[PDB]
């Protein structure tokens, strides 16, 4: 089975959403494991979200 998590984040912070990264969002909001973590998919939804 597979789980999918979803959130909206800023471009510079997308870089933080990776295994082994650190930063305000990776540390406080959503700590990705320091292990396997599957694919991270991101697209620029500025039209809808902004």
């Amino acid at each position: 089975n597979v789980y999918a998590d979803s959130f909206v984040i800023r471009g510079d912070e997308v870089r933080q959403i990776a295994p082994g990264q650190t930063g305000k969002i990776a540390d406080y909001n959503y700590k990705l494991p320091d292990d396997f973590t599957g694919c991270v998919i991101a697209w620029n939804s500025n039209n809808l979200d902004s």
Binding site: P19, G20, T22, D34
Partner: protein, 50 residues
């Protein structure tokens, strides 16, 4: 036996060889092996988990 110096060399050499092996083993801990430092706690302190 009292006078000659190298009479017991055969036993003296085995004790010396064992002591040398142990000392080289211990002195090896201070070696770097290409890591940024030779102390576990130092490395854990100065760099991030990954």
């Amino acid at each position: 036996l009292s006078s000659t110096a190298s009479a017991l060399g055969k036993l003296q050499d085995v004790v010396n060889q064992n002591a040398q092996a142990l000392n080289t083993l211990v002195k090896q801990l201070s070696s770097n092996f290409g890591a940024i430092s030779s102390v576990l706690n130092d490395i854990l302190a100065r760099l991030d988990p990954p």
